[PDB]
């Protein structure tokens, strides 16, 4: 259950993320693929090399989904329902992979926005990403 304070923190953090969301998401996906190669098994049709256009497009998609989730933080199961069906019913992704991707997103945010990455913002983003991972994993 997200606190009201952490909600404002994640809203401000992703607002300052702004227009670099696609590049940040592509870099987070690249970090996840490099440091957790078992996550690559969910993309057997992809080209998972460095600078891949497919990875860049998927990072853009993930970033837009995260932006929508931020904009609809109080009604996430409704806003993210098509993604929940995709990841839970069809893809059937292990939640450990969601944890790994959330960590890689946090690492990318830390590396790109040092000033914005205060401990409170870090905790808020961690809780927000955990909430997002819960909705996509759950089948309802």
């Amino acid at each position: 259950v997200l606190s009201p304070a952490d909600k404002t923190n994640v809203k401000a953090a992703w607002g300052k993320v702004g227009a670099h969301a696609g590049e940040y998401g592509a870099e987070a996906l690249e970090r996840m693929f490099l440091s957790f190669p078992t996550t690559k098994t969910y993309f057997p049709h992809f080209d998972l090399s460095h600078g891949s256009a497919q990875v860049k497009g998927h990072g853009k998609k993930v970033a837009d989904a995260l932006t929508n989730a931020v904009a609809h933080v109080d009604d996430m199961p409704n806003a993210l329902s098509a993604l929940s069906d995709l990841h839970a019913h069809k893809l059937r992704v292990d939640p450990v992979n969601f944890k790994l991707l959330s960590h890689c997103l946090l690492v990318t945010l830390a590396a790109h926005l040092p000033a914005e990455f205060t401990p409170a913002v870090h905790a808020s983003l961690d809780k927000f990403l955990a909430s997002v991972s819960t909705v996509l994993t759950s089948k309802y």
């Binding site: 490099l34 946090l106 690492v107 830390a110 590396a111 401990p119 870090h122």
Partner: protein
């Protein structure tokens, strides 16, 4: 922990640029803030309510210095992590009753702190090598 020679060279060069006294305490404080149930083990450190009180605690800073020194000792003995972290594993299991998952959490927080400091210099391959290092350290502590 098995690393390629290039990965080992990159890990050591970033580690030399590490300010131990600051980043160990930073990692410990961020762990205590992000995962607040970990404050149960450190309630003897004093005021740990607000994030700024956690990050401004000399006891937290000193304990972070010791945890980073153990991480450096483990890094110097990557081929003997289990024998290096035997006494610490005994202390954390039999005496402190800390969960194995909490050790993985602290490793991830340390990786986040390293990324926050190095920024662009931290690179996905360097991060992958450091992830393998901290995973090995956590496994050695969890034994």
């Amino acid at each position: 922990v098995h690393l390629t020679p290039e990965e080992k060279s990159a890990v050591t060069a970033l580690w030399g640029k590490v300010n131990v006294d600051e980043v160990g305490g930073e990692a410990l404080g961020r762990l205590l803030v992000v995962y607040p149930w970990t404050q149960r083990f450190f309630e003897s450190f004093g005021d740990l309510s607000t994030p700024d009180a956690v990050m401004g605690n000399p006891k937290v800073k000193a304990h972070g210095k010791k945890v980073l020194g153990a991480f450096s000792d483990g890094l110097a003995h990557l081929d003997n992590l289990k024998g290096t972290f035997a006494t610490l594993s005994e202390l954390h299991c039999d005496k402190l009753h800390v969960d194995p998952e909490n050790f993985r959490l602290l490793g991830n927080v340390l990786v986040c702190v390293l990324a926050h400091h190095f920024g662009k210099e931290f690179t996905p391959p360097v991060q992958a090598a450091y992830q393998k290092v901290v995973a090995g350290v956590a496994n050695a502590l969890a034994h």
